[PDB]
Design a protein around this ligand. Sequence first.
Ligand SMILES: *[C@@H](O)[C@@H]1CCC(=O)NCCCn2cc(nn2)C[C@H](NC(=O)OCc2ccccc2)C(=O)N[C@@H](CC2CCCCC2)C(=O)N1
Length: 165
Amino acid sequence: HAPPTLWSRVTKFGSGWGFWVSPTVFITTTHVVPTGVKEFFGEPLSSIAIHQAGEFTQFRFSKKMRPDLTGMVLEEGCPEGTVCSVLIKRDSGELLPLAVRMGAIASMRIQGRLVHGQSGMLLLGTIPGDCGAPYVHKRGNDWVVCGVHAAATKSGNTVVCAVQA
Ligand SMILES: *[C@@H](O)[C@@H]1CCC(=O)NCCCn2cc(nn2)C[C@H](NC(=O)OCc2ccccc2)C(=O)N[C@@H](CC2CCCCC2)C(=O)N1
């Protein structure tokens, strides 16, 4: 059961969503980042450190954007078989945590782009608007985030999260 504070890290961004890993670090999927804009969350692009690879994008800000938060562990994907939750927020405001059994980390070619991703089997599916929603799982006491939603098959049964380099 994801607690409210964890949901409150999921943030509307561009054509999808992103996730506050910490008071200063925001992650999303590269292709939802809005093109040709000059500020994010009221900060000039000059003030933001941006690291982007394989459809994973990380923003690092120069001040605490979300001081109410603590830092949580960000992993490069998770072990195969791990059951994650995709913390989906819909435009209506509905919360939709989807259980996913994760498979292998792999390079993948999706609509011609290189994705450094991890596929999973949905155990209710994902829609075009859901990209950037975090894949998390609870490690003992703490929550770990390990990817951001990037793609799904036409069936919808298989989902892909982009993961850190
Ligand atoms: C968020 O931008 C959006 C999330 C889509 C979603 O979760 N469900 C929609 C299902 C409808 N749909 C879209 C597509 N297929 N079905 C196009 C892409 N899927 C695909 O090609 O799957 C084939 C595949 C799967 C695994 C490995 C190899 C091939 C798709 O989901 N595209 C994605 C946008 C691209 C854009 C460039 C970077 C990579 C993602 C998308 O629509 N995401």
